[PDB]
Amino acid sequence: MGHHHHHHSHMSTPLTGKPGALPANLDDMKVAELKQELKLRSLPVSGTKTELIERLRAYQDQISPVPGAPKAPAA
């Protein structure tokens, strides 16, 4: 009913589902493209593109040993 096998028709998104990092082209992608990673990587798609990129960054940052960024665990 909900999750049926439907490939994202308008896809300018890379062929990836669950990576351990981020593509350096986040801002060049679109809202739905970013949401592809979000919904697959267990991230809420609620917000603006601004939030989406930052939210991806935070979910990436918990994997990164970088001390100069806002770190966030799982939710």
Smallest CA-to-CA distance from 35 within 17, 61, 60, 58 is with 17
When computed from its CA atoms, the radius of gyration of the chain, rounded to whole angstroms, is 13
For residue 26, the SS3 value is coil
Experimental technique, in short, is NMR
Matching residue, tokens 């930052």: 54
Helices (H), 2-74: 31-40, 49-61
Which structural domains are found in the chain, ordered by start? 1-75 (1.10.720.30)
Judge contact between 61 and 69, C-beta under 8 A.
Answer: yes
Number of helical (H) and strand (E) elements in the chain, helices listed first: 2, 0
Give the burial string for 1-29 (b: 16+ CB within 10 Å, else e).
eeeeeeeeeeeebeeeeeeeebeeebeeb
